[PDB]
Symmetry: D3
Amino acid sequence: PEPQMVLSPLTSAAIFLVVTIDSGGEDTVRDLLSDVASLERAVGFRAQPDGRLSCVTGIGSEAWDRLFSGARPAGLHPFRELDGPVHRAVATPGDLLFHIRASRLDLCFALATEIMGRLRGAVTPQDEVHGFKYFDERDMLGFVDGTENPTGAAARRAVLVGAEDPAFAGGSYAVVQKYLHDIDAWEGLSVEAQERVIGRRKMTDVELSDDVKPADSHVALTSVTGPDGSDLEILRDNMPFGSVGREEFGTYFIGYARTPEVTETMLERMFLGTASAPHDRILDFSTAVTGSLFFTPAADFLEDL
Amino acid sequence: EPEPQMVLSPLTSAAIFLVVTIDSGGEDTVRDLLSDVASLERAVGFRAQPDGRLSCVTGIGSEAWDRLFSGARPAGLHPFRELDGPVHRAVATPGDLLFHIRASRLDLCFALATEIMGRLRGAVTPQDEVHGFKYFDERDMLGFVDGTENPTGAAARRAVLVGAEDPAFAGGSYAVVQKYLHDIDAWEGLSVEAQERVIGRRKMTDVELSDDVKPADSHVALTSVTGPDGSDLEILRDNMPFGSVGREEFGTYFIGYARTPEVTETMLERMFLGTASAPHDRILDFSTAVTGSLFFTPAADFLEDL
Amino acid sequence: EPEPQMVLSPLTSAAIFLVVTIDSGGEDTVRDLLSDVASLERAVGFRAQPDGRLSCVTGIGSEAWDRLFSGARPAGLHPFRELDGPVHRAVATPGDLLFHIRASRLDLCFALATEIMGRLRGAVTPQDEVHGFKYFDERDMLGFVDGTENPTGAAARRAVLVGAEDPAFAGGSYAVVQKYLHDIDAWEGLSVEAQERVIGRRKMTDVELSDDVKPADSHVALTSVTGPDGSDLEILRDNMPFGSVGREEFGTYFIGYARTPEVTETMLERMFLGTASAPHDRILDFSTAVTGSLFFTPAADFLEDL
Amino acid sequence: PEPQMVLSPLTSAAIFLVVTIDSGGEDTVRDLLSDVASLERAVGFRAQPDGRLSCVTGIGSEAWDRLFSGARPAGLHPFRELDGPVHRAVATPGDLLFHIRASRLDLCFALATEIMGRLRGAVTPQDEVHGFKYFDERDMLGFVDGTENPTGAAARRAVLVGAEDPAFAGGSYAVVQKYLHDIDAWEGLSVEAQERVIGRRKMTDVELSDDVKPADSHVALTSVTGPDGSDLEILRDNMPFGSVGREEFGTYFIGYARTPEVTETMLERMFLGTASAPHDRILDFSTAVTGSLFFTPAADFLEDL
Amino acid sequence: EPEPQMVLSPLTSAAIFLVVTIDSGGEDTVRDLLSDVASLERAVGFRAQPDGRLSCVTGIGSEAWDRLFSGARPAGLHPFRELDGPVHRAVATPGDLLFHIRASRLDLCFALATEIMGRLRGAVTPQDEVHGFKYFDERDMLGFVDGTENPTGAAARRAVLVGAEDPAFAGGSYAVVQKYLHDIDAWEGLSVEAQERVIGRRKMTDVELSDDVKPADSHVALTSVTGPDGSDLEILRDNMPFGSVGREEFGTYFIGYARTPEVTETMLERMFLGTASAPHDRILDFSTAVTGSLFFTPAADFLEDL
Amino acid sequence: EPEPQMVLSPLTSAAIFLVVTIDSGGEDTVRDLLSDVASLERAVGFRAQPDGRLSCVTGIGSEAWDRLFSGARPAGLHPFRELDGPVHRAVATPGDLLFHIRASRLDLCFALATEIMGRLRGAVTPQDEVHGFKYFDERDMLGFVDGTENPTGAAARRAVLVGAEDPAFAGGSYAVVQKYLHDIDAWEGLSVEAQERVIGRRKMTDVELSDDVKPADSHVALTSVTGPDGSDLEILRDNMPFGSVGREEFGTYFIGYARTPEVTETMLERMFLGTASAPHDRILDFSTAVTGSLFFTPAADFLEDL
Ligand code: HEM
Ligand code: HEM
Ligand code: HEM
Ligand code: HEM
């Protein structure tokens, strides 16, 4: 039961590729899916010391039914649009996700080239984002981003499908959203105001004390306890991206979890709000422009095709 | 002695190329920025001492110069000359300001670009923005090592920096930019040996082909130029690969520095118009220029005294 | 499955050792910090992904334990036992809390230490603070490679982590700290060969001396201890050099982890009291212990549930 | 049971040392074998943590019987010479193998010095090769080399002796062959011809499609499926080596497997051929000059004597 | 022609600052060391070619100079001038010799310092010893990027090195040291925006405040000094953070090089005494100078010929 | 004006030394290569920008010079002078061309060597090939830090480069190579203190022995040479360890550059023949020279104009 590299850490470079499968493209796609790990090694081995090239392949709900007969992952469905009073989490088309990471962009680009070379005329590109590390693990808002990710055993338990769906053990669910930020508005706030939005100190990344942390802060809304009283956790691999000329300053959100229910709860709290908070204050400076849900199978699953 | 911009600095792993036009009434805002550009570079750059290697080279176009400054002009400064060859065309596109930003990390480039554009917002219109990245062992999108024959040391200084021939602008340089897109499908149809004949060097090892084997229409042959004096005419190239996989964009962002544009223009002419021995540069059969601009990059002192 | 603290992590290039006593009425403030310590570690540590390697191991002393917690105690937890040998003395000094902070850079250690002490200000009194640094090829102030025979992998786990023998505290460990100052003048008076006889290994190459040549009063001989089964009893050492040139302070900060303090104490006894074959450890002729404390380092879960 | 570093990855530097045990040298050898791990740490600790020094010790069939009284590894025998119609895989003497790797040659050299210092007058050197990384993981033929090595769980299953021989669990079998290449002849081929010999693209290391890959290509012949239909796999740690003046351009082949049967099958296919292929085309440019088989015991085994 | 000490070399990750006074009758021992200092630097430094970057700059005080040498004095050499402002005081403290030791690793600094002090034992009394460390992205203890506006290249040479104005000491420089301790409690009481007003630059991005927003009593404003000619007067700063968490010591070790002490002293005067527009430098409201010494750092040749 | 080869560049982690004789009728092929050598260096070297540090220094022997060129000869160029001392002998062995190839990685050296020999195949016979590697902290096979006292900067230029004393060959240098094998058995028989007396420096710390303790027959004493003017005579050494464990080969590949061979020869004479105070260099008691050749390394321009 060998998972894809869904537990691997953040890297300095990433390419996110989202495509839809054109009518009659199913066969070409199936062939690629079985060769994806082989292509990864072909490119990756060239940089074997410190390259850290990996590709995580995700398949959407509608795409799954077109590609495979038999059982479906229990949690796999189209991304649920959230129409909140103020902010909207839109659902956009996407059949296949390629989450490509390395310590260098060239490796990502080479692999992406090989994948798309095989898929040409079978797929239509929906989104392509080239992500880059920004200083000391910062996002476009200038905050350290990824701090509270689970590690080790906790990561395994939060991310990997287990006995609750045994046919797809070793798989995971990925939710992607591309966000664009209003930097003008954001930079109008004082640092202290920004800290109140996020829920952590800007420079030092220290969490605000519970008596000072607003209920509508990002950290407060995305902290979720389950029925057991245990924290519900996701693994985030967000990357900054952008284009200065077009005033694009972005966060590419990607979160892995063993069930989409966890990610969706966090989304709901952010967009719809709670009793104590109208919505996540971060959304006042952030617009989601894409939204897709994918199941990322175990590596074995892709190979045996 | 006049202090040049970082026009002599080597190739880096990351680059941002930014080309803008100055909007109506934007002159004043632009002048203010120009005087702060070196200051902004240090502000961002110092954070990543000593491996950051952040630099920004600022270029000003012909038309823009007259809008910005009174007094003398650089002797060689004019708009990019469009070349309509029998087969291939080197197009001229608008551009008033060039920002050539390099570092060993993209974040540094992006941060500086953000600061520059933040100051210029509402005074300029973006024309082009390219994020360049090192591709393996200094390769381009055609899979060839690219930059090998760049001059170094004293030779670089002599080829790139304006000297006594135009003493008011000593320490300056001329930059020609062209964004090229490549037809990878067609290129990958050729055998490696055929590709080598196009370039003029061995693909894997980057060793120059013997003179008896090197075609007259090879890229290396056409861009090798001797002056009347019999000396080699040389430019300093800082090309970077760039691209977008989804849109099938595989590019070379060409930038070349020289002490006079005449040198770069000769090479362009040989490539696009051809010689007696060669119809045109074979590389153009797989490469399309989509932008073309010429800028003068002043000495650092010049920008500061503003 | 209990999650241990980073007691199995390897040696780093930088370390801060912080030992404090809890002031009267400081218990509450201390408990709050203890529950946030892992959170503070991540807050600072994440900034320097992935080469930072920041970790903090928190230890609690015997007397402090009773002030902080009701319920069961770790089976082996007691105050450091003073050893008054014929010649050398291992002193016991006050210490309630241990912070063993390691990273590949001192800044990370310093930042974390700042955050911890910021929260504890007015609740604790500092007893000791040492900033450790890697010295050449893993050498100590005596000029010998130091840490060679540390257990690794499964052997490390078995030697260091509390298991079924005390199931309520599984995943914990015991840390013994001693700050040593060295008489470099006297030490440098010895020939290299004499120094090798003191340690029990070759100086330059770090190769262990043959059994027929290794003195019974050598450091290696005295600290080699076999258990009832005839297997070696082992500890995990994270010693760091430290010092101040002006004050002629050349130090080894000793810290050793073990699943039971009995192992470390046996080695101490052999060193300070001697055996039938050896009066004492010859290393002590050039080394003075100035502190001595024992701490229990709980599993990470234990700290969090507070 | 603790294996030797048989699963560890490729490094930038390696020393391969093959010796025979002289008459009456048994005792000296046994002493060293029990100290080998100790010597490794003595040298290795000096270059923590980027040194990555390791030594894998192998013992030959004939040597085993001279050294030890009890049971033998089930698969341990002398290297089987293969006399093909055209190419020959020679068997050469070798009692002990020292496979020494680090990120720096000095570390390898220091350890080798210590080992040989202890063995002087008890062993005769047969072969010594100093290997070095060549660009982006290339061999002397200019191809990326090691791409299809198994990793993680697959590596463990392919390499480590398990329950099928429980007394030697955690051990492995190493086959070494020193190859010299005819670079003149090789460089006479076009790149496309070279690709047909190997079975992969030269520059990009992408495997040739199944409809284009020759049956006598290196990749085709070394593929090998077992009765179960699963792939048979070995772990390769080949290093380039050579001397420019003497026109020596070499590949030092070393492959680990849980049973020698796997490696021997690949050898047989290469040298003797199949129904579809006379022999491996790579052998047309490669001459084996040594050939030895060693069993590499678990670390515990070496320590306990 | 004259070979300077490493006074133009950049900031490193690690530093040791050592200040000693020469005891009565210690002159001879000191002279011997001074002639061997470069030799000791190479002895230690060569071991860590090429990334070690070990250097030692040796400075000699005014009073010490007269005790050590007969003949001419550097034109600008005098004791540090104490400044008694209305509110803040720049104290002058004893110091005859300065050793400014830098490397990319502390071990190298410590080894060299050990060798130097080994030779000087019983001839000198230690006054101060500080172990400096890089803090994140070139930050100081106040959390601001520190060193941004240092001159580079030719400008650095012109600002730092003694030239024709004192030809017997060409290639020398003047170093002013001050150890500052910071009141972090008070400082962290300010909002970021208030802190920016104190310094004169943005905290996170290190971008200089616009001239219309920058307070006259900001650090940047007061230390910006124009000469009669209208040119900027510049110094080269190699400040390092240092500190001890337990004792609440958060420090900046200030060291500035200049071709004449007049430049540094002007900046000091503006900071401590104030101008017409500003009572004093606001940074001093959170910073206390605890040492103050002035040294002349001779050309390397000068030390060798001794 | 004349541009030297990379004779001033520092020591690297990897080196290949290649010595060949020119076969009868090979002159033409050799001349062609000589003119392409810099081109080949760039072809390979550019692939590993910027940390590759690939360089090739080409040397031509006395006899070879006369076969290759007409006209004036370098003033100092002659065959290596055999030294038959009472005890030790410095042998002269054949060698027409020297290729001193250095980089931070062996692959780069090997690739370049491959290209050079590929062009020379059937025109030259290999005499010697050594692959050198860095050994710990810049140590040699004797376990001593090696290269410490090399001149740097201006001093290096003055010691190494031919100047006005032979103006036709300004920018050239003279290289003396000797391959030494060491008797490690005998050497390891000495105590460390005895070894230090042989070399003239401390083993571990690389600190030079005081003048009152340093033997007259120590390596450091014999190779310290003053000229008639009282100035120190200096050479630039790029020695590399090499060896083969199986064959008990532990070597130092000696290469020294100087502006005149007279300097190197004086040091050789002192070592092999001795002085009034010393029979010979004690290092030779554990070191055997197995090759000896002298080459002139022309300015880069000289090779190009061919
Ligand atoms: C709009 C773009 C977003 C930005 C700029 C952003 C930024 C941040 C930052 C700065 C933190 C605190 C440091 C950390 O632990 O990573 C954080 C925490 C977190 N974010 Fe986001 N975030 C974004 C969107 C989202 C979304 C859409 C989700 C969930 C679907 C999410 C889930 C989380 C979670 C779970 C945490 C950790 C909370 C905790 O347990 O302390 N984020 N984010
Ligand atoms: C006074 C300061 C000390 C110094 C400078 C020192 C130095 C060394 C050195 C150089 C070694 C050999 C290399 C190695 O395996 O690490 C060593 C080994 C060792 N030291 Fe220490 N040590 C000191 C104090 C202690 C103390 C107090 C203990 C016990 C509580 C201790 C326990 C050990 C052990 C167990 C070994 C490994 C012995 C073996 O199995 O070979 N050391 N020490
Ligand atoms: C004569 C020298 C040899 C050279 C230059 C060589 C080179 C290569 C190359 C370039 C590849 C493709 C990249 C890779 O997967 O590593 C490869 C694959 C392989 N080689 Fe070799 N090889 C040699 C000898 C051998 C020998 C003697 C064996 C074993 C008997 C062997 C077993 C393999 C295997 C198992 C593969 C992987 C094939 C797959 O499953 O896709 N090779 N070799
Ligand atoms: C037998 C092989 C040799 C070895 C192992 C060796 C080793 C050393 C060592 C360890 C040093 C002291 C550190 C240093 O400054 O580099 C040294 C210094 C030196 N060696 Fe050698 N050396 C050898 C042969 C030679 C030869 C043949 C010459 C020149 C004829 C030479 C010239 C020098 C010089 C000039 C110095 C510096 C002396 C000073 O001013 O302090 N060496 N060598």
